């Protein structure tokens, strides 16, 4: 027989298996591919590991408390320090890569909840004080949750990024975010969500350290609710796999 | 252009206070660099590649550029007493940016 | 020279005219275009995309994620109304800041259907039946389930599939309705009721939530562009 | 042209079009006939005015500055940027990337400033609008050698003529203007962060060619931008909160939506 | 070398356009482009989901 | 259109493209693939705006003179020469010989001069721009018979109209304007030495046709030169030192280049 | 008469428009053109030609012929840096007054490769090996030969042939870089190191000099003409 | 007697020009002339020097 | 014309040029090539950077004194800490790679000397 729910994604040397999953969302309808020569601008021969970098990386799990507003991961920054994808990112100047985001959160039949797994391109965010911009390590997080905060962030002489969940830190309606490729994790039916994101930047290639093209935001629209006696620590673990990595401009390591 | 334009630097009395005014210039900016520091009135001036004490009685000989046109205009005020808002106004003809620093103690 | 007379309207400036004008910099070699995933050619394609509707915009809840969730629970009764809002995608606050509604606020005339998609975000064991119902303009908003039973309605049942769509038909005397409020072009009333009760087993929550989405069908049209009334400005930034 | 509805009769089948799964992220493509009975109506309506080109082709003022003919502010210097205004800025933001040609139009207006000089018989005013490309020499006084015009594109407009209108071709080093930039100019990630870092389109200078007369006159120049040949990529949700700054996306937290009486209220 | 195209009229006519400037960035706005494809944003799923058939089998 | 790069793999051969001999004076024609590995990139960039015609076709003011309607300086007399200005002069110098048509445009601006005469209600000003060819009669007073205009090309422009624009065909006894002349007019080699000796393009006279009104008005006329149909021969290095005179190439010794901190400094 | 309306932009003057205008002197018989050796039709042909680069622009040396010579000598060590400069053909002082750089200062956008040609003007017996190396943007300028070894490099060896060209590749995210300084479009770092030592026999000088030339490859393009910032003027001459 | 030529457009259109003045020195600027030959200034050597082959044999 | 001495080797993004050089010695007559499938034993998909790792690395110079006996470099160990060749070596378990050794030592016409540049397989010491 056949079943729509089951799905198995294999990449590099690490594959994932989801018994209950909703159909994969293929970005804007464009599966990621290597830079065609009709639009190349770097004359150097690009290195393409294609196995070393194109593999499923599992980031750090985060707890989904009934009081958890949301989380955001800058995809390039998140993998900056993990494996060769991180090493080659540190060395090469230019970097072009598609993404295969996959967020797992499994709960029993008696739990309830709903996540919005959406990857936002160019998530330029706003600082608590209007005049200054947020600093790195506040806006960015290395394998870190970078959690949203429901309360509006107090505005003083600081560089704290607005974590206001009802604005998503971009001063836009969180409900209207759906426009970006998005998959919901309704605990009652699907415990996993996968979005294949194409490389979405205005230039053929960009330095990954200089700029983060896409940011995975998990915003629980319906809070987790369970009766006493059920497991109280249900985590959300994110496994992001790069695809079609292409790097130019070999230089000394650093940034 | 100036990094972190609103800042609140609190420092105890007796040690030098480092007040940063690091700035980045746009391609459109091709003008004489005029850096002026104000307190709440003019502490220091930088025009024509020279530094001016400006005869400020409260801060004479205690204020100097830590670094310059490279992009740094920070000041290390020494031997604080000085409490007020320090405004650094790097100047370019297309855009002039200013940074306000509140100093405590 | 060619003898010409200048008709009225010459030497004027119009904000909505397409004409030709000499380029300040001639023979500029523009940067060649590339392929960027997701080119948009029509605003209505964006309107078709789903957008969460803050149905529970009550009081302070517009300042929290509680604005979108619609509360349902097992109550000893039936026919109790779950929610209700007028069909004014442009003027109604319920729809005003939704992606369809906000784009609509950039226009004056609208026509077409609406895909209200209701997603049950309750437990996996909770089973609730709901009478999504849209009443056409003309009478007062229905106060009881029996009153709403008459108008167009879908008896949504919850199972393996979660979401159910209520496709609001385009019932109207005028080919286009005004985006703003008007007695002449009242869109209608959209409401939900409990067909039965949301029964749950023991050791499971009895207070489920429901989210609602809005979208435009493939027969949606807009005309008469105008500046939006939501943005504001005092001086240049 | 918009798609039309297709007739339908009563139905009773296993197939369900309404019941779906919004978790997948696929907006259901349900027509009205799926959940009711509908007649065959030929819809002649056209989605012509909702086109991206028609949406953003309206001339819209971005910035107005005022320069006097005698006094401190002899000339006006404004860095080119669509972020200064609100309506046009919000229109453009709807798309993460955008590639459009420009048709700048200048509406210049003079005004006899109150004074006491007598026999004020001013001759017709003449104005000059000069576009300095980034990295180009910039005027410091109203009469510097830069105003003479070597290669920069400048327009001379005598007052009372039709407003000057010069078209600008796409001007970006990248392949498209980036409305949003989640990046820093510095590799170190320390410094300015945002759209300002990557978007420099030059500077605009406006001055009085002739002083005009004995009495002081203040000239207001309004700059209008109309995107043309526009191509937009990656649609994004519209800016919900009011803009606070021109160089950054910083905002003040605002209610998702204007509230109503109750969850069943109809106002 | 004049290009003749239909004018935007009601439902239920020609106009002549000649490009004067040779720059080609001075051409009038290309408003008459009524092409759309909702598949990129609406229905972005990798595997087709027939609306009549059950979504999650 | 610019040439593109061609792919290359690893190589190991006797042939060396990098190692060359710059003593010969042949600039090595080395593409990027010669000293590394490169991919096949189709460069769609075009050297269209670097053309000699596009380089020098911008209108650029060469000289502005001011003539009053009543007083000592009733009319303005300027000898035609592109050397008076700096930007256009430097642009033209890049080529030892140049052959271009001209499109002179005049931007005239009036100004009510401060005075004490009352009831100043001046009528619209009318101006006349007359080109005296070399060897032609030249006006001495504002109302001499020369102003009547016998055969010289003159343009009458009432104020408030679009600025006057008359095209000039190539005007040189030789086969091309000589930007640089290493020669004397006198065979003896005693006298003026330089470009001034061979370049005479006539004289330009500007006057007020009508006095205009009771009060004194000063009229500023700006002359703009735009080379068109340009052909240039023998490219030369650009003028490094600032110009000091209009009739000669005399200069003040200046540093080859602005200095930096050290030989390894990156600023 | 033909009824016309004047569109906005009429009766104005634009410094960058090509149109027609009546000739002041009609039917002037222009002097027929001849053949002059070296007609130039494109500015980029001049950019391709070699131009000496004042790499040693240190202090007072910009006021002497010592600006062009780059000093090398036999020192008891290896990996010592010989010189270094940023890849900013427009803004960097090293390149600003070179023929490629000065023509570039008349434009705003540049893209393409650069042929840095290094000519060894030492003795005939001196044998020196040098690691010409260009580091792509992103990290700090290399401080040691090993750091530079990674980036694109050519191990130039001196023999019968003197000059060796380091063809700097076009590595960049943007199709065009700004001629002026900008953090977004940092061109990169170009540096030279001693692969070994410049060994010389006795009775021969141990202090050789090296000259550097700059040129644009056949894939160089410029756009957005602007007036140069190097020239200046107070009053007409 | 109108001359029709292609407008300068981007990479990856026609305009009509009619010469009004008969002088022919009043014609618009001939910008569309993209012809180049670097051999006159670059590579001016009498005997060809193949780049791959050694320069001074 | 032609000359045997001159030679230019380009690999990755870094090339070398030798005005005077003797003919290259191609190992035992077998130019290095990727592992053919007729003799593979690892079932994993191998990563092949082919530019990131295949580039000229310049090690540290050593002085040739009149009293210098000799020098030895373990090629894999020598590049263990240089660039991606080092990084990928640290990560991956198995590693197969050919080598392109090049030793430079230039002296004037009046110097004299002679080196033996020889690569020894399995130099168990």
PDB file of C-alpha atoms in Angstrom, chain F residues 124-253:
ATOM      1  CA  UNK F 124      10.370  91.165 -19.277  1.00  0.00           C
ATOM      2  CA  UNK F 125      14.110  91.317 -20.205  1.00  0.00           C
ATOM      3  CA  UNK F 126      15.257  90.452 -23.776  1.00  0.00           C
ATOM      4  CA  UNK F 127      18.876  89.293 -24.402  1.00  0.00           C
ATOM      5  CA  UNK F 128      21.031  88.903 -27.569  1.00  0.00           C
ATOM      6  CA  UNK F 129      24.022  86.474 -27.876  1.00  0.00           C
ATOM      7  CA  UNK F 130      26.233  87.296 -30.936  1.00  0.00           C
ATOM      8  CA  UNK F 131      29.134  85.109 -32.211  1.00  0.00           C
ATOM      9  CA  UNK F 132      31.812  87.258 -33.944  1.00  0.00           C
ATOM     10  CA  UNK F 133      33.920  84.962 -36.233  1.00  0.00           C
ATOM     11  CA  UNK F 134      37.700  85.734 -36.017  1.00  0.00           C
ATOM     12  CA  UNK F 135      38.623  88.792 -38.153  1.00  0.00           C
ATOM     13  CA  UNK F 136      35.024  90.086 -37.878  1.00  0.00           C
ATOM     14  CA  UNK F 137      34.016  93.574 -36.581  1.00  0.00           C
ATOM     15  CA  UNK F 138      33.676  93.634 -32.739  1.00  0.00           C
ATOM     16  CA  UNK F 139      31.242  95.898 -30.761  1.00  0.00           C
ATOM     17  CA  UNK F 140      32.766  98.707 -28.603  1.00  0.00           C
ATOM     18  CA  UNK F 141      29.513 100.112 -27.086  1.00  0.00           C
ATOM     19  CA  UNK F 142      26.208  98.362 -26.292  1.00  0.00           C
ATOM     20  CA  UNK F 143      24.525 100.174 -29.200  1.00  0.00           C
ATOM     21  CA  UNK F 144      27.082 100.141 -32.003  1.00  0.00           C
ATOM     22  CA  UNK F 145      26.137  99.214 -35.597  1.00  0.00           C
ATOM     23  CA  UNK F 146      27.742  95.762 -34.995  1.00  0.00           C
ATOM     24  CA  UNK F 147      24.827  94.798 -32.654  1.00  0.00           C
ATOM     25  CA  UNK F 148      22.317  95.277 -35.549  1.00  0.00           C
ATOM     26  CA  UNK F 149      23.665  91.915 -36.957  1.00  0.00           C
ATOM     27  CA  UNK F 150      24.726  91.749 -40.625  1.00  0.00           C
ATOM     28  CA  UNK F 151      25.866  88.158 -41.161  1.00  0.00           C
ATOM     29  CA  UNK F 152      27.180  86.928 -37.794  1.00  0.00           C
ATOM     30  CA  UNK F 153      25.068  84.202 -36.136  1.00  0.00           C
ATOM     31  CA  UNK F 154      23.213  85.678 -33.172  1.00  0.00           C
ATOM     32  CA  UNK F 155      20.308  84.412 -31.078  1.00  0.00           C
ATOM     33  CA  UNK F 156      17.649  86.607 -29.468  1.00  0.00           C
ATOM     34  CA  UNK F 157      16.190  85.051 -26.290  1.00  0.00           C
ATOM     35  CA  UNK F 158      13.434  86.710 -24.181  1.00  0.00           C
ATOM     36  CA  UNK F 159      13.751  85.798 -20.456  1.00  0.00           C
ATOM     37  CA  UNK F 160      11.532  82.941 -19.135  1.00  0.00           C
ATOM     38  CA  UNK F 161      11.816  80.938 -22.404  1.00  0.00           C
ATOM     39  CA  UNK F 162      13.658  77.572 -22.657  1.00  0.00           C
ATOM     40  CA  UNK F 163      17.465  78.282 -22.677  1.00  0.00           C
ATOM     41  CA  UNK F 164      18.842  79.004 -26.217  1.00  0.00           C
ATOM     42  CA  UNK F 165      20.731  76.091 -27.876  1.00  0.00           C
ATOM     43  CA  UNK F 166      22.565  76.503 -31.205  1.00  0.00           C
ATOM     44  CA  UNK F 167      24.720  73.665 -32.601  1.00  0.00           C
ATOM     45  CA  UNK F 168      28.201  74.534 -33.996  1.00  0.00           C
ATOM     46  CA  UNK F 169      29.861  72.381 -36.747  1.00  0.00           C
ATOM     47  CA  UNK F 170      33.596  71.527 -36.432  1.00  0.00           C
ATOM     48  CA  UNK F 171      35.442  74.898 -36.756  1.00  0.00           C
ATOM     49  CA  UNK F 172      39.178  74.414 -37.358  1.00  0.00           C
ATOM     50  CA  UNK F 173      41.512  75.193 -40.230  1.00  0.00           C
ATOM     51  CA  UNK F 174      43.460  72.031 -39.465  1.00  0.00           C
ATOM     52  CA  UNK F 175      42.036  68.521 -39.628  1.00  0.00           C
ATOM     53  CA  UNK F 176      41.424  68.356 -35.861  1.00  0.00           C
ATOM     54  CA  UNK F 177      41.478  70.660 -32.813  1.00  0.00           C
ATOM     55  CA  UNK F 178      44.973  70.315 -31.255  1.00  0.00           C
ATOM     56  CA  UNK F 179      44.598  70.037 -27.434  1.00  0.00           C
ATOM     57  CA  UNK F 180      48.419  70.295 -27.082  1.00  0.00           C
ATOM     58  CA  UNK F 181      50.724  72.285 -29.419  1.00  0.00           C
ATOM     59  CA  UNK F 182      54.520  71.989 -28.840  1.00  0.00           C
ATOM     60  CA  UNK F 183      55.208  74.916 -31.218  1.00  0.00           C
ATOM     61  CA  UNK F 184      55.454  78.719 -31.639  1.00  0.00           C
ATOM     62  CA  UNK F 185      53.333  80.825 -34.053  1.00  0.00           C
ATOM     63  CA  UNK F 186      56.548  82.645 -35.124  1.00  0.00           C
ATOM     64  CA  UNK F 187      59.068  80.712 -37.327  1.00  0.00           C
ATOM     65  CA  UNK F 188      61.789  82.594 -35.345  1.00  0.00           C
ATOM     66  CA  UNK F 189      60.591  80.669 -32.198  1.00  0.00           C
ATOM     67  CA  UNK F 190      60.201  84.001 -30.312  1.00  0.00           C
ATOM     68  CA  UNK F 191      56.713  84.918 -28.980  1.00  0.00           C
ATOM     69  CA  UNK F 192      53.653  83.097 -27.515  1.00  0.00           C
ATOM     70  CA  UNK F 193      54.211  79.296 -27.244  1.00  0.00           C
ATOM     71  CA  UNK F 194      51.301  76.853 -26.817  1.00  0.00           C
ATOM     72  CA  UNK F 195      47.644  75.927 -27.615  1.00  0.00           C
ATOM     73  CA  UNK F 196      46.552  79.623 -27.679  1.00  0.00           C
ATOM     74  CA  UNK F 197      48.680  80.294 -30.822  1.00  0.00           C
ATOM     75  CA  UNK F 198      46.739  77.832 -33.065  1.00  0.00           C
ATOM     76  CA  UNK F 199      43.255  77.866 -31.479  1.00  0.00           C
ATOM     77  CA  UNK F 200      41.100  80.880 -32.292  1.00  0.00           C
ATOM     78  CA  UNK F 201      37.368  80.154 -32.394  1.00  0.00           C
ATOM     79  CA  UNK F 202      36.012  83.733 -32.430  1.00  0.00           C
ATOM     80  CA  UNK F 203      34.465  85.938 -29.692  1.00  0.00           C
ATOM     81  CA  UNK F 204      31.023  85.814 -27.952  1.00  0.00           C
ATOM     82  CA  UNK F 205      29.063  89.031 -27.128  1.00  0.00           C
ATOM     83  CA  UNK F 206      25.985  89.172 -24.820  1.00  0.00           C
ATOM     84  CA  UNK F 207      23.850  92.329 -24.271  1.00  0.00           C
ATOM     85  CA  UNK F 208      20.399  93.546 -23.067  1.00  0.00           C
ATOM     86  CA  UNK F 209      18.152  94.334 -26.043  1.00  0.00           C
ATOM     87  CA  UNK F 210      15.985  96.479 -23.759  1.00  0.00           C
ATOM     88  CA  UNK F 211      17.070  98.242 -20.582  1.00  0.00           C
ATOM     89  CA  UNK F 212      14.206  96.441 -18.877  1.00  0.00           C
ATOM     90  CA  UNK F 213      13.142  98.907 -16.216  1.00  0.00           C
ATOM     91  CA  UNK F 214      14.018 101.839 -14.019  1.00  0.00           C
ATOM     92  CA  UNK F 215      16.148  99.843 -11.544  1.00  0.00           C
ATOM     93  CA  UNK F 216      19.578  98.350 -12.438  1.00  0.00           C
ATOM     94  CA  UNK F 217      19.487  94.586 -13.283  1.00  0.00           C
ATOM     95  CA  UNK F 218      22.634  92.382 -13.555  1.00  0.00           C
ATOM     96  CA  UNK F 219      22.398  89.471 -16.059  1.00  0.00           C
ATOM     97  CA  UNK F 220      24.561  86.363 -15.540  1.00  0.00           C
ATOM     98  CA  UNK F 221      25.099  84.311 -18.702  1.00  0.00           C
ATOM     99  CA  UNK F 222      26.534  80.783 -18.335  1.00  0.00           C
ATOM    100  CA  UNK F 223      27.941  79.092 -21.494  1.00  0.00           C
ATOM    101  CA  UNK F 224      27.701  75.256 -21.734  1.00  0.00           C
ATOM    102  CA  UNK F 225      29.784  73.179 -24.208  1.00  0.00           C
ATOM    103  CA  UNK F 226      28.823  69.559 -25.058  1.00  0.00           C
ATOM    104  CA  UNK F 227      31.176  67.797 -27.597  1.00  0.00           C
ATOM    105  CA  UNK F 228      29.168  65.614 -30.056  1.00  0.00           C
ATOM    106  CA  UNK F 229      30.273  63.386 -33.004  1.00  0.00           C
ATOM    107  CA  UNK F 230      33.647  63.252 -31.230  1.00  0.00           C
ATOM    108  CA  UNK F 231      36.692  61.488 -32.663  1.00  0.00           C
ATOM    109  CA  UNK F 232      39.841  61.434 -30.550  1.00  0.00           C
ATOM    110  CA  UNK F 233      43.414  60.542 -31.446  1.00  0.00           C
ATOM    111  CA  UNK F 234      46.619  59.840 -29.439  1.00  0.00           C
ATOM    112  CA  UNK F 235      45.504  59.301 -25.782  1.00  0.00           C
ATOM    113  CA  UNK F 236      47.735  61.124 -23.236  1.00  0.00           C
ATOM    114  CA  UNK F 237      48.087  60.847 -19.351  1.00  0.00           C
ATOM    115  CA  UNK F 238      45.512  62.979 -17.417  1.00  0.00           C
ATOM    116  CA  UNK F 239      46.693  66.369 -15.952  1.00  0.00           C
ATOM    117  CA  UNK F 240      48.022  65.451 -12.448  1.00  0.00           C
ATOM    118  CA  UNK F 241      48.742  69.024 -11.176  1.00  0.00           C
ATOM    119  CA  UNK F 242      46.109  71.786 -10.742  1.00  0.00           C
ATOM    120  CA  UNK F 243      45.721  74.221 -13.708  1.00  0.00           C
ATOM    121  CA  UNK F 244      47.072  77.755 -13.018  1.00  0.00           C
ATOM    122  CA  UNK F 245      46.418  79.561 -16.360  1.00  0.00           C
ATOM    123  CA  UNK F 246      44.052  79.345 -19.357  1.00  0.00           C
ATOM    124  CA  UNK F 247      46.469  80.193 -22.198  1.00  0.00           C
ATOM    125  CA  UNK F 248      49.303  77.808 -21.134  1.00  0.00           C
ATOM    126  CA  UNK F 249      50.029  74.347 -19.586  1.00  0.00           C
ATOM    127  CA  UNK F 250      52.156  75.931 -16.791  1.00  0.00           C
ATOM    128  CA  UNK F 251      51.721  74.015 -13.496  1.00  0.00           C
ATOM    129  CA  UNK F 252      52.938  73.911  -9.861  1.00  0.00           C
ATOM    130  CA  UNK F 253      55.026  70.742  -9.027  1.00  0.00           C
TER     131      UNK F 253
END
